[PDB]
Symmetry: D2
Subunit: 175 residues, 4 copies
Amino acid sequence: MRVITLAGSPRFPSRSSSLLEYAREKLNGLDVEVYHWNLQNFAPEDLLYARFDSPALKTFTEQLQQADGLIVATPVYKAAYSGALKTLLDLLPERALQGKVVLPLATGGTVAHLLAVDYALKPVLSALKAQEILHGVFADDSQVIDYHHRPQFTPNLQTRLDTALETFWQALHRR
Amino acid sequence: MRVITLAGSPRFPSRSSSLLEYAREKLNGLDVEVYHWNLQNFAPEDLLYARFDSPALKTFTEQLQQADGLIVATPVYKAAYSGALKTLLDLLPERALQGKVVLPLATGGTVAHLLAVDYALKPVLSALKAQEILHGVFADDSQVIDYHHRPQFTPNLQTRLDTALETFWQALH
Amino acid sequence: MRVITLAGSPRFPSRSSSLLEYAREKLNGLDVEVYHWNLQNFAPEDLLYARFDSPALKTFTEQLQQADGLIVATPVYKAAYSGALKTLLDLLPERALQGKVVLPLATGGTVAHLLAVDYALKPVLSALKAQEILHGVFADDSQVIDYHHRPQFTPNLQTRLDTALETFWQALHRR
Amino acid sequence: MRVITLAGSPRFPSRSSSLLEYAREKLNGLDVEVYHWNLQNFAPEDLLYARFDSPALKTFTEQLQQADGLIVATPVYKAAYSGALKTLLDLLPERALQGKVVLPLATGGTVAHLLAVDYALKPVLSALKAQEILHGVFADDSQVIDYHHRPQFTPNLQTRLDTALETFWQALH
């Protein structure tokens, strides 16, 4: 019923930010309550010096607390998630993702950094006590033919996004 | 509705096996068909030298195929899952865990190696294409009071298994 | 001959920042060229939006490029290094640590996060092509009796720091 | 000056073994005493069921003890080192790699699993208390032209091994 999407890219547009876009579209077409957040919504000073009294933080958190699931996306810098995504994740409370389904997406220069999703990003979401984390979707920069206006992906990438969004929705209303 | 439990300890019984026995007991009470495997069901030479014509592997592959979920348990050695368990996971098909809900369990002599679950076991399960991996339970040895004749846990460890197992049951619907 | 020390804590003082302090002292007492950098030396805006034209960045990089080794320290937030440390590491060039010995140090609330050094931090330094990375030192918050004025550690922590600094210096002048 | 090479492939020869043979050849040329082990030197049942009285394990432990460095090589399976190799690492003493310089090598069917070295193999070596772990070499299968009768690599893979091996030699001084 309620989903947070979180773009983790330090720049806009991003190849990663556009994976999240396509999902947002496919999901809005279900009148599911979606709340998109990106890093451009926070003050750099609050994220760096780790200031928990961030007003932006309180509003995101309140929305997170009410969301049934999280779809989070990040470029792969230095064999992990962006540090910029991490500074925010660092501010969330200890059990922020408890009870929530999570869907991680990621892009990278090379397929050689595919394992950053499983070995860097998923443990962090797990530290935050995600109830369940999906397999997720990684795309090397070659699967994205255009991320500037409409996202164009290769059929393979689009398919893998479809499959994962499908799983994601079903997990979002188990009883 | 079929679940596989898979013990990854090289000795049996073990602390991690007792977790699976407890899980079995809770799942049978809910009319799940549960099938238990351990490393002792395979010929060591088939595992260590990766021999794909292992009869047991064929049986275990079929059983897994038709299974909706997997509970896997391992002791933590050298900051990761056991080699012993990994020898078996290495022999499974590329997409063996596709469509499946996976509950990882582990035991460890020191709480210092709690992260072995997230940083070592989960990635390997995700390489087998697990559809979703539950948060899981790490138990330091001292939370497992008896593992030989009847699983007996401290209240906190018991409560955490119970919670995980309920999430696991719900996920299978 | 030339070492960079890098505090990765978002706050000062930090339990982690003080591990780096004790090292800096022990090493200055050898007239080794040490260049201490912390996150307080960078503009939050540059680190977040990933601005490579950071003047602070150019000066750190130039000093890094000339350093024979790096000693880097971080608290353990969410089962990894701080995102704040990461935003900087994200800006360094692709092969920044090539040819250099690296010594990682870290602190955490609980010993349960000891493995964050090996599974989160070391891969990032390795992505940066560290020639060699030392075993390193992790300390739970209980090993630090006081980090505010002089660092007080338990003998065990001090010993483990000594052992690692020893190894560190020897590796810094192989021929 | 003693080096152990340790092949972690479950079949022999393998692509990762050919790397170690190449390394051996380069190290002997520099008057290093090199001792080679592989998984076939151990009884599978001792590895898979973690039996510490394995004679081979005793010999390998002694040899490692007196060794200054270790070159270890493994294929990448299910996004990590081989279970087969891990069964052996799990049987080594707690501080087995203390004081030692370690050079990790790996091979993989897809470059997609290059990070298995940093995210999986290194942590386990560091749990054995390796004094320093070199950057290492990942080679996708296609860079290993022959591994059966004479190690034969593409120029780039050969150049990267050469560089690593020189760093390794210097570190042993």
